[PDB]
From a paper:
Five members of the CLC family of Cl− channels and Cl−/H+ exchangers, ClC-3, ClC-4, ClC-5, ClC-6 and ClC-7, have critical roles in endosomes and lysosomes, catalyzing the exchange of two Cl− ions for one H+ ion2,10–12. We recently found that the ClC-3, ClC-4 and ClC-5 clade of endosomal CLC transporters requires the accessory β-subunit TMEM9, which we refer to as T9A or its closely related homolog TMEM9B (T9B) for proper activity in cells and animals. To resolve the mechanism by which T9A and T9B regulate the activity of ClC-3, ClC-4 and ClC-5, we determined structures of ClC-3 alone and in complex with T9A, finding that T9A occludes the Cl− ion pathway and that inhibition requires the endolysosomal signaling lipid phosphatidylinositol 3,5-bisphosphate (PtdIns(3,5)P2). Each ClC-3 protomer comprises a cytosolic N-terminal domain (NTD), a transmembrane domain (TMD) and a cytosolic domain (CD).
Residue numbers in the entry:
A (entry chain A), C (entry chain C): 78 to 369, 374 to 479, 495 to 737, 745 to 811
B (entry chain B), D (entry chain D): 23 to 114, 156 to 183
């Protein structure tokens, strides 16, 4: 065929049927030449193993990048607190790792690590030291945020945000050139570490998926099968997303489930195993780099009791209640950024948000602590070996009020800041903030339950289930349940979320609680809206995304969505013969239609095929270059084989999808979703009457939603 | 390396003596309560009880990996900053891709920041 | 509409589009009446929660039945060995559970448990005692097999076989009335225990899915939404299958993955969480009954080393090599049962197979031991506490030859007997025999590797990876890898299998080995055929199953598959008007067509709709009963509103799927698979030319396969 | 119940004394090496080492559940066998369902055993 045929412009949807046709044609061509020569056999073998090789490379790259990002973020987050002069490349934990000056009260206290006050003022303690630590923390947060936003803006503007919504749109057939490119990969890799160091209310777990999605895309250029076909490239992208989730949470099964449930519009059977293998390889790479078998390991000796489900369900009620609120809040803010004037100053907005976050976080120990480290601490149980402040009250009698107040203040601060942090022009993840909020809520609930059980053990439930004066209630489990509930409420993921939490915890004994909590949260979220945060952002950005939930009215019919309608003039049509190249070029230039139907005759209106505008222009230009005399006067004939008429039957889709005008849109939407059609041709009495494009369906659904 | 490995252990407060920490660089077989704790405050009859109460762990870290990752990340960040400075100050087949990417980045920067709305 | 419209005959495929249309119409009707009255609101609330209630009931029933089946099978399997006179209801382990006469050498030795020789002959040891034990074991196996086969034949002979192939066919839209009924449920529940007790080379894990699939079906009759719609019922069946796998292996995540990957042709997003919840509930029920947190718990202290992957891959080579062989062997036998004369005597065949199995199994201790118990023993590591014969050699120096010979004999016996056991007319599972074969192979490989490492520690690989004179090699892990490889080779499941094995083991540190082994096995199996054992049995039974793997030739077009063709007369067509009821009845009786197209006129051949034969006859009979004077002379008009003409527009599909004759079958198959169409109407120039039914596609694919 | 619970340990062969088993009915707090093993063959200085070498586990079983499940399964099997015998010997809205099921099972039994090929 003519070079460039079958390609698409930026910000356009792909035709899955045509992609499958091209893939099958290429497979036939490759397999036909296998017997021709040994080199052809080797090429065919490479083509067969192209999927395995690309998934392996994507997993390796994702694991390496995740390990590097984690290590760099851990190293930089402690630069705000102080510096290790002896080894500038060691964070607070690593600098104090091998020091014998440690103390039981302070595990990370050793003379090697010097706080900024000691570096400049020269005193480790005192009002001046505290003031200088405050100022240096603020300055470092501002510097990191400014560097991240500047790098995002200058080099890869697409690196901002989690990227899960855009990945969801892309995997549905949308095209965003440069989103999954090398520049975006590098810039997001650097800026994720920078933003996590800045201390903003965001995470690097969810965004890592984008990183993975980038790597595979790049690797898709090393294999012609996946470089030339968009559907195969999107399958590779789904595998990359699974690997990214796996490295983010160390949950290969959870990553595969997330890919299947959230981001993959189409998930063939082979993609399941390919994604699983890629995720496993990436997890192996991370385990061979980062450790220096679970991240949020927990040890709840007491098995969870049945009555504890009731508090857990309560956490679910919270998890949804915040979730929906966030969806109502963040979007309300994000839309404002797209409508008000503060969106014209992204760098200033990021700097101000970082300033506020650091200023309000430094005074409170929980907020100052890293969000991932805060979740780690909240997930641990209280015991004689531990010396966390949260457990102080337990050691005092068995201040609880002070700890509860601090936790509540941290929860309020994180809830308020996550709304203003998500959507800014830096790589921002929603998993870590939501998990931290839910963990704080669950820790508070568990502390309350423990206090009730200890002080009121006379109650029949506690006495029967719990031995008097026993540590049956584990606040760590409550924090885990709260984190899972909040994540489910904000994202609405149900099975992938539970499996990811279980893998990131390693505890299979708490599957039933988590699930239940998640369920509750989801339902509560669905009470205030069935759209998740990612889907809400997709709608806000106006991406052409079609979801199974969206449905049309029963009365609506195909005739009500046909493009020609009444006011619009007759839809562009190409005659089979007796038509000049100049006419085709003029029609292409005049109209923005993605494609044009072809009819036997203007009066007959008997359908022949569909000619895409891009293919039309590419073929016309290539024919003009190759063959002399094509000056626009030569006629163009689409019929099967002096003027040397141009032959355009190759670029013609001889089997355009056709539906009847009386067919309800209820079935048209189902056809579009299942088959991934880009356009359908509504016919009546065997002739062409109109065209219904995926854009028309999306516009109708958006209008109906706006009316609501 | 002596920095890569350690063996440390933590004892909770037993009777009069409060909880304490003891670390030293030994191999796995040497890492134990009696060897690590020297001297041990607890009396003779309670020595073993203290050992059970205390928890000793031997750990190993890859300092070289952290070193290399930090160094490469810092070099990449510095190169990116220098290239940015050259772009904003000095600039006013590889080259062709470079200007094509410059036009592309101008486009996407207009799309993401100036408008925030690429609806297609 | 007329009562009975929308139903299907036995052994027919459902139209998924029509089922979705009916479901949406019912949803509209239910939601429209919500404001009418409070009782309507309660009915709507019940309808909304119908899915949750049905999945909960299915999970509870599946868990209870799985626990009962497991306990009964465990109790009966030991009846062959002996009896506990003091408590006839205790197996060998339970009878000896609280006895102080136990010994270290014999854990289950106590005077309470009496072997049949002691009961009759009166001596626990001696040639006569051994002979009598042999005879009684054979007699009990024969009695159990005869009772199982007789119960299957008399009451619910659909209970034979695993049922996974038939479940796969049903979930694709096929209808088998009585397969998932109450009679089948009860008979399979009893006969699974009976067959497992008989000692035949089969399992009760895979077949349990059928049990679950039955329960939900019954519960689907308690909810109108799922009782009236076939697609919703099939979603409930998918959830039931997930719960069944969960109870079989205690793997709710594994059960969901198996449902998604193997048995569910269509798996909506909601079905994922519904199946997960049902599986979790069923697992909870099983954990609340059977224990009296993992079944095949293992303790491999030494972490798996990288070089151990190479032996594991070898096991994969075995796993596939046997797998394909079994697919080639069992089918070859099964086809013979359908072609030779020994299939006319199912009871005799079952009795003979049981006789041979018992006779050859009793002499060898491993074969005599229960297959599940054999897998349990093989999965354990060797240590000072254990006293298994397999580890005797390790205690002797550190007879290995005797243990290896016994394991090889057991492997050969199981491999030979599984071919002749699968397919007989009793509930037979393939998971347990395949896992046992793979476990024996892996145990042999691990013993060989341990011997090589100990005797030849000078080798650089062993010396570097393993400390000299250390138990680094764990034969239990090798047995687990071999079992996983064999199961993957025989079933070709990739991710669901790995997750099921991990959950049934509880060890997350061995995910990478298992996966790799599975991959190898699958590939090796794919080298000798891409069809699994379940798909092979589906093809053997001739069920109308369409799979994504099957594809047509490029040259093939729709015109080559249209029903009318050339030799066949013109396809039946109904005129819009001027047509009598007698003509319609005569056409219905004469032709076996599932449906008839409707045209405006005979000459015009302008399509109007599609009238299903069942709906046609039901409507005609109902109209005759309701309205007097319909004696066949009255004309039938399908057009929109003295003879009182019958109105049949309600039963007419006003939007029958239409394709062009030039459209390649490559796209027709994709449309049929994605949309689950039951028929398509091939048209040319806007008129009706032919009909392509799913039966035609299946027949063409079967013919092409037969030619190969 | 005394039958439901038990506590037993197994000791591997230590020096001269071979491995041994000891079981008794006690509570969890009583279940330990010293209490369960009485007398213990090992000498005075090796008593503690023997305790580490040995492993005592406290277990509980639900005898009532196994009782009930076995009883109900046996009753169901006996009822099924009696109904079968009645069908083959005695027989030659509930009744209507019974005869409809009889016809259905006859037809589907013909499909399964007689032919094995119910292709549609
Ligand atoms: C340690 C710390 C961790 C760091 C993380 C490392 C992993 C990152 C991968 C390395 C990539 C490197 C980035 C090269 C830019 C690129 O190579 O950028 C292409 C434009 O020239 C150029 O080299 C411009 C280079 C100007 C100077 C470079 C200075 C160097 C900076 C200092 C640090 C570098 C160290 C990295 C080592 C690793 C344009 O390529 P792109 O960036 O891919 O953007 C579009 C997209 O790929 C579309 O893809 P899609 O449709 O699938 O979405 C295509 O279709 C379009 O193709 P077109 O050119 O025909 O329009 C294409 O432009
Ligand atoms: C403890 C040990 C563990 C045991 C396991 C317990 C769980 C099992 C569930 C209990 C079911 C019980 C089985 C009742 C037969 C049934 O009730 O059988 C229907 C035919 O009359 C009859 O009662 C005949 C009853 C003659 C005497 C019964 C003696 C009793 C025997 C002694 C033991 C009983 C104890 C069980 C307690 C639990 C026909 O019903 P079916 O068995 O459902 O077969 C067809 C299918 O359901 C299609 O479904 P599909 O299209 O979805 O595939 C429908 O559509 C067709 O409907 P149609 O009648 O209009 O043709 C339908 O016949
Ligand atoms: C083209 C892309 C996919 C290649 C990416 C290769 C990456 C994954 C490779 C390059 C260098 C590798 C590392 C090199 C050395 C070691 C030390 C060893 O004790 C564990 C593995 C580990 C930590 C490797 C992990 C994988 C690694 C990071
Ligand atoms: C944006 C990111 C990548 C930049 C990170 C650079 C950091 C690590 C640099 C910037 C300024 C540096 C400090 C500048 C001056 C001194 C004084 C010297 O006697 C010891 C090192 C010390 C204390 C440096 C430590 C490292 C330091 C904090
Ligand atoms: C209509 C169908 C779905 C109902 C099925 C209900 C089943 C699942 C119910 C009925 C009786 C129940 C059991 C009754 C008593 C006990 C003892 C308790 O210590 C643990 C739960 C356990 C073991 C229950 C498990 C669930 C159970 C088996
Ligand atoms: C097909 C299945 C369900 C039938 C199971 C019934 C079994 C358990 C029955 C059948 C025959 C029975 C035996 C028949 C006779 C005796 C002698 C008596 O002094 C003690 C019980 C004893 C030893 C019985 C034990 C239980 C027994 C083995
Ligand atoms: Cl995140
Ligand atoms: Cl995110
Ligand atoms: Cl099985
Ligand atoms: Cl099976």
């Amino acid at each position: 065929p003519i070079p460039g045929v079958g390609t698409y412009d930026d910000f356009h949807t792909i035709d899955w049927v045509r992609e499958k046709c091209k893939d099958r044609e290429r497979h036939r061509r490759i397999n036909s030449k296998k017997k021709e020569s040994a080199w052809e056999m080797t090429k065919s073998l490479y083509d067969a193993w192209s999927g395995w090789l690309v998934v392996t490379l994507t997993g390796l790259a994702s694991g390496a990048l995740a390990g590097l990002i984690d290590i760099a973020a851990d190293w930089m987050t402690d630069l705000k607190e102080g510096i290790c002069l002896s080894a500038l490349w060691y964070n607070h934990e690593q600098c104090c790792w091998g020091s014998n000056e440690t103390t039981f009260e302070e595990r990370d206290k050793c003379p090697q690590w010097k706080t900024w006050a000691e570096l400049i003022i020269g005193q480790a303690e005192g009002p001046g030291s505290y003031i200088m630590n405050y100022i240096m923390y603020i300055f470092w947060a501002l510097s990191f945020a400014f560097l991240a936003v500047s790098l995002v803006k200058v080099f890869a503007p697409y690196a901002c945000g989690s990227g899960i919504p855009e990945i969801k749109t892309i995997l549905s057939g949308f095209i965003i050139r440069g989103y999954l490119g090398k520049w975006t990969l590098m810039i997001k890799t650097i800026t994720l570490v920078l933003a996590v160091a800045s201390g903003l209310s965001l995470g690097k777990e969810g965004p890592l998926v984008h990183v993975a999605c980038c790597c595979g895309n790049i690797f898709s250029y090393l294999f012609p099968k996946y470089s030339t076909n968009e559907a195969k490239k999107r399958e590779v992208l789904s595998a990359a997303s699974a690997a990214g989730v796996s490295v983010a949470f160390g949950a290969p099964i959870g990553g595969v489930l997330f890919s299947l449930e959230e981001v993959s519009y189409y998930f063939p059977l082979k993609t399941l195993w390919r994604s699983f293998f890629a995720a496993l390889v990436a997890a192996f790479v991370l385990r061979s780099i980062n450790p220096f078998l679970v991240l949020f390991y927990v040890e709840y000796h007491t098995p969870w009791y049945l009555f504890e489900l009731f508090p857990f369900i309560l956490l679910g009620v919270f998890g949804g209640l915040w979730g929906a609120f966030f969806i109502r809040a963040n979007i309300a803010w994000c839309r404002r950024r797209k409508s008000t004037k503060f969106g014209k100053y992204p760098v200033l907005e990021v700097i101000i948000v970082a300033a506020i976050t650091a200023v309000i976080a430094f005074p409170n120990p929980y907020t100052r602590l890293n969000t991932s480290e805060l979740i780690k601490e909240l997930f641990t149980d209280c015991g004689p070996l531990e010396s966390s402040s949260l457990c102080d009250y337990r050691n005092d009698m068995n201040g609880v009020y002070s700890a509860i107040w601090q936790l509540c203040l941290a929860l309020i601060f994180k809830i308020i800041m996550t709304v203003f942090t998500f959507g800014i022009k830096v790589p921002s993840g929603l998993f870590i903030p939501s998990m931290a909020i839910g963990a704080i809520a669950g820790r508070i609930v568990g502390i309350a339950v423990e206090q009730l059980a200890y002080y009121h053990h006379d109650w029949f439930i506690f006495k029967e289930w719990c031995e008097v004066g026993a540590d049956c209630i584990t606040p760590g489990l409550y924090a885990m349940v709260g984190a899972a509930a909040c994540l489910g409420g904000v994202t609405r993921m149900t099975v992938s979320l539970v499996v990811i939490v279980f893998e990131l915890t390693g505890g299979l004994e708490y599957i039933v609680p988590l699930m239940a909590a998640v369920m509750t949260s989801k339902w509560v979220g669905d009470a205030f809206g069935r759209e998740g945060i990612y889907e809400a952002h997709i709608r806000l950005n106006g991406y052409p995304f079609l979801d199974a939930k969206e449905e049309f009215t029963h009365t609506t019919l195909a005739a009500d969505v046909m493009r020609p309608r009444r006011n619009d003039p007759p839809l562009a049509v190409l005659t089979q013969d007796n038509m000049t190249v100049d006419d085709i070029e003029n029609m292409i230039n005049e109209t923005s239609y993605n494609g044009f139907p072809v009819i036997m005759s203007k009066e007959s209106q008997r359908l022949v095929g569909f000619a895409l505008r891009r293919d039309l222009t590419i073929a016309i230009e290539s024919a003009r270059k190759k063959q002399e005399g094509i000056v626009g006067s030569s006629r163009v004939c689409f019929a099967q084989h002096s003027p040397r008429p141009l032959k355009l039957r190759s670029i013609l889709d001889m089997s355009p999808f056709t539906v009847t005008d009386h067919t309800p849109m209820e079935i048209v939407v189902d056809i579009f979703r299942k088959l991934g059609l880009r356009q359908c041709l509504v016919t009546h009495n065997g002739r062409l009457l109109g065209i219904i494009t995926k854009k028309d369906i999306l516009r109708h659904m958006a209008q109906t939603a706006n009316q609501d | 390396s002596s920095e890569d490995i350690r063996c440390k252990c933590i004892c909770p407060p037993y009777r009069n003596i409060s909880g304490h920490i003891y670390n030293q660089n030994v191999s796995q077989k040497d890492c134990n309560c009696l060897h690590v704790v020297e001297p041990m405050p607890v009396p003779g009859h309670d020595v073993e009880a203290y050992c059970l109460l205390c928890e000793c762990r031997y750990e190993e870290r890859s300092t070289t990996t952290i070193k290399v990752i930090i160094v490469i990340y810092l070099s990449v960040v510095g190169a990116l900053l220098l290239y940015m400075a050259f772009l904003m100050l000095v600039d006013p087949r590889v080259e062709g891709a470079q200007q094509r990417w410059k036009l592309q980045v101008q486009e996407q920067r207009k799309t993401v920041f100036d408008r925030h709305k690429m609806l297609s």
